[PDB]
Write an enzyme that holds these catalytic residues in place. Structure first.
Site, PDB file in Angstrom:
ATOM      1  N   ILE A 248      -7.483   1.217  10.054  1.00 32.91           N
ATOM      2  CA  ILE A 248      -7.904   1.951  11.256  1.00 32.91           C
ATOM      3  C   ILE A 248      -9.425   1.882  11.432  1.00 32.91           C
ATOM      4  O   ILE A 248      -9.926   2.149  12.507  1.00 32.91           O
ATOM      5  CB  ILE A 248      -7.446   3.424  11.210  1.00 32.91           C
ATOM      6  CG1 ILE A 248      -7.520   4.054  12.604  1.00 32.91           C
ATOM      7  CG2 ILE A 248      -8.275   4.218  10.203  1.00 32.91           C
ATOM      8  CD1 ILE A 248      -6.984   5.478  12.678  1.00 32.91           C
ATOM      9  N   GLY A 249     -10.150   1.525  10.372  1.00 31.87           N
ATOM     10  CA  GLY A 249     -11.604   1.407  10.413  1.00 31.87           C
ATOM     11  C   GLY A 249     -12.148   0.276   9.555  1.00 31.87           C
ATOM     12  O   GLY A 249     -13.351   0.217   9.319  1.00 31.87           O
ATOM     13  N   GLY A 250     -11.281  -0.634   9.109  1.00 33.98           N
ATOM     14  CA  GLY A 250     -11.672  -1.723   8.180  1.00 33.98           C
ATOM     15  C   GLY A 250     -10.913  -1.777   6.850  1.00 33.98           C
ATOM     16  O   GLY A 250     -11.258  -2.534   5.956  1.00 33.98           O
ATOM     17  N   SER A 251      -9.848  -0.994   6.742  1.00 38.74           N
ATOM     18  CA  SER A 251      -9.169  -0.769   5.474  1.00 38.74           C
ATOM     19  C   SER A 251      -8.317  -1.916   4.944  1.00 38.74           C
ATOM     20  O   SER A 251      -7.839  -1.851   3.818  1.00 38.74           O
ATOM     21  CB  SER A 251      -8.333   0.484   5.591  1.00 38.74           C
ATOM     22  OG  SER A 251      -9.199   1.594   5.679  1.00 38.74           O
TER      23      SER A 251
ATOM     24  N   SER B  43      -9.160   1.500   2.590  1.00 37.16           N
ATOM     25  CA  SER B  43      -8.160   2.193   1.775  1.00 37.16           C
ATOM     26  C   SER B  43      -7.147   1.291   1.066  1.00 37.16           C
ATOM     27  O   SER B  43      -6.491   1.738   0.132  1.00 37.16           O
ATOM     28  CB  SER B  43      -7.420   3.243   2.619  1.00 37.16           C
ATOM     29  OG  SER B  43      -7.152   2.791   3.936  1.00 37.16           O
ATOM     30  N   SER B  44      -7.009   0.035   1.480  1.00 37.30           N
ATOM     31  CA  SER B  44      -6.021  -0.849   0.855  1.00 37.30           C
ATOM     32  C   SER B  44      -6.566  -1.489  -0.424  1.00 37.30           C
ATOM     33  O   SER B  44      -6.438  -2.698  -0.633  1.00 37.30           O
ATOM     34  CB  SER B  44      -5.548  -1.927   1.832  1.00 37.30           C
ATOM     35  OG  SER B  44      -5.182  -1.356   3.068  1.00 37.30           O
TER      36      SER B  44
ATOM     37  N   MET C 158      -6.515   8.036   2.323  1.00 43.02           N
ATOM     38  CA  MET C 158      -6.807   6.718   2.890  1.00 43.02           C
ATOM     39  C   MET C 158      -8.019   6.703   3.808  1.00 43.02           C
ATOM     40  O   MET C 158      -8.146   5.791   4.632  1.00 43.02           O
ATOM     41  CB  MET C 158      -5.596   6.188   3.647  1.00 43.02           C
ATOM     42  CG  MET C 158      -4.342   6.211   2.839  1.00 43.02           C
ATOM     43  SD  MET C 158      -3.065   5.245   3.627  1.00 43.02           S
ATOM     44  CE  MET C 158      -2.525   6.413   4.879  1.00 43.02           C
TER      45      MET C 158
ATOM     46  N   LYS D 172       0.882  -1.162   0.000  1.00 41.17           N
ATOM     47  CA  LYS D 172       0.000   0.000   0.000  1.00 41.17           C
ATOM     48  C   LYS D 172       0.919   1.210   0.000  1.00 41.17           C
ATOM     49  O   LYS D 172       2.045   1.151   0.528  1.00 41.17           O
ATOM     50  CB  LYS D 172      -0.893  -0.015   1.229  1.00 41.17           C
ATOM     51  CG  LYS D 172      -1.975   1.038   1.280  1.00 41.17           C
ATOM     52  CD  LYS D 172      -2.796   0.842   2.573  1.00 41.17           C
ATOM     53  CE  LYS D 172      -4.071   1.696   2.618  1.00 41.17           C
ATOM     54  NZ  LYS D 172      -4.916   1.484   3.848  1.00 41.17           N
TER      55      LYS D 172
HETATM   56  C1  LIG Z   1      -9.701   2.297   6.675  1.00 39.75           C
HETATM   57  O1  LIG Z   1      -9.359   1.829   7.761  1.00 39.75           O
HETATM   58  N1  LIG Z   1     -10.468   3.377   6.579  1.00 39.75           N
HETATM   59  C2  LIG Z   1     -10.916   4.055   7.779  1.00 39.75           C
HETATM   60  C3  LIG Z   1     -12.426   4.145   7.727  1.00 39.75           C
HETATM   61  C4  LIG Z   1     -12.829   4.878   6.461  1.00 39.75           C
HETATM   62  C5  LIG Z   1     -14.332   5.131   6.390  1.00 39.75           C
HETATM   63  C6  LIG Z   1     -14.748   6.251   7.323  1.00 39.75           C
HETATM   64  C7  LIG Z   1     -14.923   7.533   6.843  1.00 39.75           C
HETATM   65  C8  LIG Z   1     -15.332   8.557   7.689  1.00 39.75           C
HETATM   66  C9  LIG Z   1     -15.568   8.303   9.024  1.00 39.75           C
HETATM   67  C10 LIG Z   1     -15.380   7.025   9.506  1.00 39.75           C
HETATM   68  O2  LIG Z   1     -15.624   6.749  10.817  1.00 39.75           O
HETATM   69  C11 LIG Z   1     -16.879   6.356  11.217  1.00 39.75           C
HETATM   70  C12 LIG Z   1     -17.903   6.206  10.287  1.00 39.75           C
HETATM   71  C13 LIG Z   1     -19.147   5.794  10.727  1.00 39.75           C
HETATM   72  C14 LIG Z   1     -19.362   5.550  12.077  1.00 39.75           C
HETATM   73  C15 LIG Z   1     -20.732   5.144  12.538  1.00 39.75           C
HETATM   74  F1  LIG Z   1     -20.800   3.837  12.583  1.00 39.75           F
HETATM   75  F2  LIG Z   1     -21.641   5.631  11.702  1.00 39.75           F
HETATM   76  F3  LIG Z   1     -20.991   5.653  13.730  1.00 39.75           F
HETATM   77  C16 LIG Z   1     -18.314   5.713  12.975  1.00 39.75           C
HETATM   78  N2  LIG Z   1     -17.113   6.108  12.532  1.00 39.75           N
HETATM   79  C17 LIG Z   1     -14.983   6.004   8.666  1.00 39.75           C
HETATM   80  C18 LIG Z   1     -12.369   4.002   5.313  1.00 39.75           C
HETATM   81  C19 LIG Z   1     -10.850   3.903   5.284  1.00 39.75           C
END
Ligand SMILES: *C(=O)N1CCC(Cc2cccc(Oc3ccc(C(F)(F)F)cn3)c2)CC1
Ligand SMILES: *C(=O)N1CCC(Cc2cccc(Oc3ccc(C(F)(F)F)cn3)c2)CC1
Ligand SMILES: [Cl-]
Ligand code: NA
Ligand code: NA
Ligand code: NA
Lengths: 543, 541
Positions: free
Chosen positions: A208-211, A187-188, A161, A112
């Site tokens: 960090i959020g599912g990437s 993002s990956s 990302m 990445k």
């Molecule tokens: C990879 O790891 N990533 C990180 C996560 C982003 C998507 C994203 C974009 C903007 C904000 C957030 O965080 C978020 C979204 C929704 C919620 C909810 F569940 F609605 F409360 C909480 N946090 C993530 C993709 C790339």
């Protein structure tokens, strides 16, 4: 900051670099194929990574052969996907250097773009990071190299990302190799598209959020997001530094779960622990990974936040039943207060400062469509996010909650939030032990969303984000593909809320017949070997 | 209104009085049934031999327990280090898992280690009458590991002084000299272990609070890497401050005891009970290694002028280590001022001290805190103003004031990142010079009895490694000679501000008191650290 001349310049320069990279790799593969016309490429490219490595090690396949073949396939699949942003400087000199004893001797690996590499930009699709070549390899790159691997490409990421799609104004948009109208995830996403089309046996993403998990699932490969600090984030390019509430995790993506294990086994050694002493020196415990003992498997079929696609539901239920049939005990289990963990803990951890540090990276730059209205929204003033939240609250509660939790706070309120996250983690762990789980089975978002919708199906991050917030190792393994039956059932989908996040997801998951659907595997912190053991079981029983 | 605080002070004192009575009655009842028991021989057994004999069956748990309970009660008369006697530790005595690595070992706990049915007051009024619902994780594992936690030991009010007085249980004293501080915040433990009353205890340390009392009371203690052990169930007064890690660790009469304690605590019981802790077992072979060490050393941190005794202690252990065939390399972590004044202060007081100050609402403020509470309470604009007034004259004070103001989350992230990079800076430095380990002065001798709260600068030798999150231990290596103490007259600090002035005075009249040296290794290198501490110990004892 409304002039775009610099951004346009960076876009042109980056494109000429990627065009030049692609030319360079083309010339090399032709030069090679001329010298090696009898080489059976298809046999080599379809070798599982374990067998590739053993043949590398035996000497049956030379590094040259596997490298230029994979390079060949990468260049080819990239035509359809636009996942390769750069060809990595003197990876060919590294090819002939690769330590012969290395656990990944002669293995080409994709990176990445944020994994910094000597002499290369890690643009993140941002204009301000163009023309700023990193002055050295990041730590996990150094160890890959030390362990015999040959990092060969930088793969595309969405701008900053921070979308789970994969376009940016520099290198453009990366496509799902299974269907051009679909997102590869992110993002990956570059990694997902590349590895998922056979162009790389092993790559590294971040999450960090599912990437790691979105692209792995969307592109039908496996990926693991370990415990944040299991691996060294040293030398990684990001756009917010010092946010510690929600840990950034990095990890492997690959065609089988054995590959993920090999990659961890390779990374978790004296080289890494030396180069970065801040990482706990936890070696890869193979005996735990290779265990074939029964598992108490917590499971949920929905998180009551993001209604699963019929495909996901079936994928989950089916792997549940197969796990039960394989003599594992399946226990209904749902982590407490997911809404709280997502709407206040996660959003607040990620946007503790109103998004201001993040927003700094976009000054002067174009904002890619696949980010959606994120930048527009973060830019809203604190008082207006407040006001809007209160007006929206009676009508669209999820959106209200989102707005309300992305405001600037004092250090004082940040400490309070980190403490709630800390206890939240311990609340779920207690639940876990009370129920006496080994491991946890969950839905993974899927199938692949349409190609500009991840930035507007914001709620759907719920299945993965929860475990970023908890900092639990979580991995994802494909288990099925969308049947027409599942695809038609999408017309009966109306989410749990009916807000536009559900509406956009509903639409975005249609026309998905044949796409891979995955399942998520979770273990407790520091248990990536256990987690992989579970993933391996899932993989076995569904494949 | 202080009537609640007075109530809490009365009730706590009753509980301590009652605890002490209870312990006395038990020891008397035991001594009657065991008049032939050689207490002295037992009390002076090093911990490793104590454990062997517990394990062999040569000494019964009852015997070691009630003997130590006896000594604790006795030494507590002169020191006031015991706050509470721990609920059915006697029923725990007869349960103690026979296999446990600490089978039948009585252990003292700093009061913040929560215990079922007990207050962890922290000397705070608001925490009185708030019994913990259950044992904290490291207590649970001690117990599971055969140990018998028997007392809570005193701490300074809020645990944010390196003295040891609070308005509930009063003031704990140094067992070597009653006019001296036992150190803190783990001061109760220091006094108790350092007078023979407990073979092994647990403290905590966010700024030196294991190492101050250990060194002041002439015992050894280790502050491991923050997350090497579980902080689960620990009582504090600020939660969610993650810039400067709170670390917990062992205090004991020899370094072997510190190693045994880690070996015992780092096991499936702990890793299960708190999966957030990395499951890193104690690596004996590294602790037991007898190969040479490249030892970085410095004599002074150019911040806190060492006492003659410190300098001597440092230089002497250096020469002994060299004689023992270790290579000693001049080495001083870069930008200590930065690390202390901005990184450490800012990390500990990111919020201006407001969270911390919440605990004092309505409560008395113990003198051993000094003017800390008064200062944190100052408005942000005035801290700023006072800072730039003081800057030309008293730069340390200016810096301190200026860095303890509220900030945005935004600025906190920035600070956090500067701590991450500073950590990486010292590590690259360390690696550049190829150090195995680092030898350092430790603050000492023990300060006079209300001066730690006013010698705020002297936190420098310890604080630095809380900031870096390096395992750091302290071992006693000499005592203040009349020479050292006299040369104290010619002591001026590096600044000559009131922190040096108070420290000069506080460290006087210290003849015969133990002085220590500090041993530091890289993160997660506790067993290397201890290996070095054992070497120091060995060569100076
Ligand atoms: C990879 O790891 N990533 C990180 C996560 C982003 C998507 C994203 C974009 C903007 C904000 C957030 O965080 C978020 C979204 C929704 C919620 C909810 F569940 F609605 F409360 C909480 N946090 C993530 C993709 C790339
Ligand atoms: C045990 O761990 N502790 C924590 C630290 C306190 C002592 C203390 C009181 C108030 C503030 C600080 O932090 C601090 C003081 C001074 C400096 C200087 F060196 F001046 F820069 C930096 N940080 C510590 C005792 C008990
Ligand atoms: Cl950690
Ligand atoms: Na809601
Ligand atoms: Na809300
Ligand atoms: Na200064």
């Amino acid at each position: 900051w409304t002039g775009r001349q610099k951004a346009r310049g960076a876009a042109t320069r980056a494109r000429q670099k990627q065009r030049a990279s692609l030319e360079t790799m083309d010339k090399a593969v032709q030069r090679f194929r001329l010298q090696n016309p009898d080489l059976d490429s298809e046999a080599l490219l379809t070798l599982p990574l374990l067998q590739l490595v053993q043949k590398l090690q035996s000497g049956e396949l030379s590094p040259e052969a596997v490298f230029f073949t994979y390079l060949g396939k990468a260049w080819e699949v990239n035509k359809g996907t636009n996942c390769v942003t750069s060809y990595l400087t003197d990876c060919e000199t590294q090819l002939s250097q690769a330590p012969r004893q290395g656990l990944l001797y002669g293995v080409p690996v994709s990176l990445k773009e944020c994994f910094s590499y000597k002499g290369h930009d890690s643009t993140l699709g941002l204009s301000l990071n163009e023309g700023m070549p990193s002055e050295s390899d990041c730590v996990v790159v150094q160890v890959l190299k030390l362990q015999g691997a040959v990092p060969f490409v930088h793969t595309n990421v969405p701008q900053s990302m921070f979308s789970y799609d994969c376009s940016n104004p520099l290198f453009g948009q990366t496509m799902n190799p299974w269907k051009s109208s679909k997102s590869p995830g992110g993002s990956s996403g570059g990694e997902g598209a590349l590895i998922g089309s056979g162009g790389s046996p092993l790559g590294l993403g971040t999450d960090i959020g599912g990437s790691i998990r979105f692209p792995s699932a969307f592109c039908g490969i496996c990926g693991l997001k370990p415990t944040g600090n299991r691996l060294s984030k040293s030398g990684l390019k990001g756009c917010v530094y010092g946010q510690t509430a929600v840990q950034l995790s990095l990890g492997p993506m690959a065609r089988d779960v054995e590959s993920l294990a090999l990659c961890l086994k390779a990374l978790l050694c004296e080289h890494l622990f030396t180069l970065d002493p801040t990482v706990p020196p936890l070696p890869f415990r193979e005996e735990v990974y290779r265990s074939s003992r029964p598992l108490r498997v917590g499971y949920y079929e929905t998180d009551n936040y993001t209604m699963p696609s019929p495909a996901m539901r079936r994928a989950l239920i089916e792997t549940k039943q197969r796990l039960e049939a394989a003599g594992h005990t399946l226990i209904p289990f749902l982590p407490n207060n997911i809404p709280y963990a997502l709407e206040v803990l996660s959003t607040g951890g990620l946007f503790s400062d109103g998004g201001r540090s993040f927003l700094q990276n976009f000054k002067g730059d174009f904002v890619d469509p696949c980010l959606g209205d994120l930048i527009l929204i973060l830019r809203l003033p604190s008082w207006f996010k407040r006001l809007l939240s209160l007006l929206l609250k009676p009508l669209f509660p999820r959106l209200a909650a989102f707005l309300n939790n992305m405001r600037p706070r004092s250090a004082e309120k940040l400490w309070k939030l980190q403490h709630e996250i800390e206890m939240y983690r311990q609340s779920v762990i207690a639940q876990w032990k009370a129920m006496n789980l080994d491991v946890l089975l969950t839905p993974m978002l899927g199938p692949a969303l349409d190609l500009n919708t991840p930035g507007r199906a914001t709620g759907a991050v719920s299945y993965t984000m929860l475990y970023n917030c908890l900092d639990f190792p979580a991995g994802v393994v494909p288990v099925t593909t969308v049947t027409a039956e599942d695809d038609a059932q999408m017309e009966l989908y109306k989410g749990y809320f009916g807000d536009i996040w559900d509406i956009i997801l509903k639409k975005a998951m249609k026309n998905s017949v044949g796409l891979p659907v995955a399942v998520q595997c979770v273990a407790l912190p520091w248990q990536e070997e256990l987690c992989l053991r579970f993933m391996r079981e899932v993989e076995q029983l569904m494949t």
